[PDB]
Amino acid sequence: GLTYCTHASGFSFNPQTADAGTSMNVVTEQIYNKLFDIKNHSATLTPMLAQSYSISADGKEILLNLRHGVKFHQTPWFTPTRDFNAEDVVFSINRVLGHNTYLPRFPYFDSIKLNEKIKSVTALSPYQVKIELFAPDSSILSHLASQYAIIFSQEYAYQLSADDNLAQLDTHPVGTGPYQVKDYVYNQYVRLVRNENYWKKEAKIEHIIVDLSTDRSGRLVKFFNNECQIASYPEVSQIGLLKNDDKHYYMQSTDGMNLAYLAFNFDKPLMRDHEIRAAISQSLNRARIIHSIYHNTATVANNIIPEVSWASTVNTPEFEFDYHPKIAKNKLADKNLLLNLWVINEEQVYNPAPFKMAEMIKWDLAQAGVKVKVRAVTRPFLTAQENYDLILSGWLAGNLDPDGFMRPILSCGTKNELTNLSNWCNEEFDQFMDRAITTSHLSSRAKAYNEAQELVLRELPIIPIANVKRILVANSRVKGVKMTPFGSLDFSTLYFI
RNA sequence: CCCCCCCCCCGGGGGGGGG
RNA sequence: CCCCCCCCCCGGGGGGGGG
Ligand code: NA
């Protein structure tokens, strides 16, 4: 038996209804399968519930050849009568599109505008699905390779819709994953059991417990008390107490798309001025923030696309609007500015201490003659929308295709949404973005993505602060631990020595 | 229902090459 | 230890033929 301790923050049996760029769902990574997986810095489509695929010459039609003999979980709440087929695929994508499921808000898919990408998803055979596209999109299968594109049971959802019970789908799960849900208690624990009739090499550990109960501080406490074999997201100050010399535990870090940033509200006539935006950035000592907030578990970010992305062809050039308080003091002190800085009051994966950082920003800006008034704001209060002049947020993405993170944050389409906190719209940026998905080749795709990044770094719609590392601590008995920038953790590979 | 071919998938074992 | 080829075995699913 194995115990995985993590935060109760962001816990869901459905990453589809979850707010985008906030999590990597460790639970749905085990109980649900996608059609494909992408677990390499080359973005190779690993076949999962789809054995293979082919794209039409015009690029507007994708055909998916689904795996045979795949069965859904046999749980106390559901007992399947048939194998996985085209019907389960058709239901799952049509739900997120907003198309007919034929039964008695998806933040990620809304921000990437899936229904504007997909025309239709239809079953040709029980083991063949046809995807119609409005125009060629080289990002489609990468989005269907993401944590958000899990496949649900059509047989289960038909039975549930028969009694208005479709809410159960997210309370009592049924998937094809290597692990199965046994029992749980919300925000406390999840009890997983190995799926015996799995379509691939079976899970090595029969029983896994996902512990959500303990706080960030007492997580390493529970670990060293040996009631916890893998400890995820530990307290940042506690990391500097740990070592790589120990023969009883080891640490594993990973880089990826885990960005903390500051956005300018472009609904504020002052914030629409490039002069002040470039000066506010020059007033910020982002180097000093990395030590006080992250204690060497982060990189000062002068990029939007991580270096682990196939789209990173730029070797992160010097930032033109980096810390220089003298230039900042001149342009701002004489302007006599007072700005409302909002901070989302929640646990952030890209921010251990968001309010502490908001004080360091309030301090750095006062030196150059800018008055900052920080406000603790809730996620639904912001959704309701003195309005903010600056907001402190970020993005955590496993999908390293910049269509999945740069489009939600800076596109015109998402301007009046929670994803684009800058309320920015640049038709030249949307131009590069659109071009980057009409071309199928990496050379062509990375060129347009670097062009858009270069534009973002000069227009300054956001100030990138940190390149955050996701950390975990594991016991020496535990082998089969592989932390990747592409997703959460695969519990199938875990085993004791 | 049994026996035999072809195709795809999965798992295991063995030999060759690359980091 | 990971990734990839070749060979053999096993199991499952699908299509063709014989009793
Ligand atoms: Na918005």
Numbering used by the authors: 35 to 138, 163 to 443, 449 to 560
Quote the authors verbatim.
Crystals were nevertheless obtained and the structure of the 60 kDa SapA protein was solved to a resolution of 2.6 Å. In SapAclosed, the lobes enclose a cavity with two narrow openings to the protein surface. Since the location of the SapAclosed cavity approximately coincides with the ligand binding cavities of other SBPs, we inferred that this density might represent an endogenous ligand likely derived from the cell lysate. The SapA cavity volume is even smaller again at approximately 400 Å3, which implies that SapA can only bind a small ligand such as a single amino acid or dipeptide. SapA co-crystallized with a strand of endogenously acquired RNA coordinated on the opposite face to the binding cleft. The RNA crystallized as a double helix with parameters consistent for standard A-form dsRNA, with a radius of ~12 Å and pitch of 31 Å with 11 bp per turn and a rise per bp of 2.8 Å (31 Å/11 bp).
An essential system for NTHi survival and persistence in vivo is the Sap (sensitivity to antimicrobial peptides) transporter. This multi-component system uses a periplasmic protein (SapA) to bind and deliver substrates to the heterodimeric inner membrane-associated Sap permease (SapBC). The Sap ABC transporter is completed by two membrane-associated nucleotide-binding proteins (SapD & SapF) that hydrolyze ATP to provide energy for substrate transport across the bacterial inner membrane. The structure confirmed the classification of SapA into the Substrate Binding Protein (SBP) superfamily, as was predicted from sequence analysis.
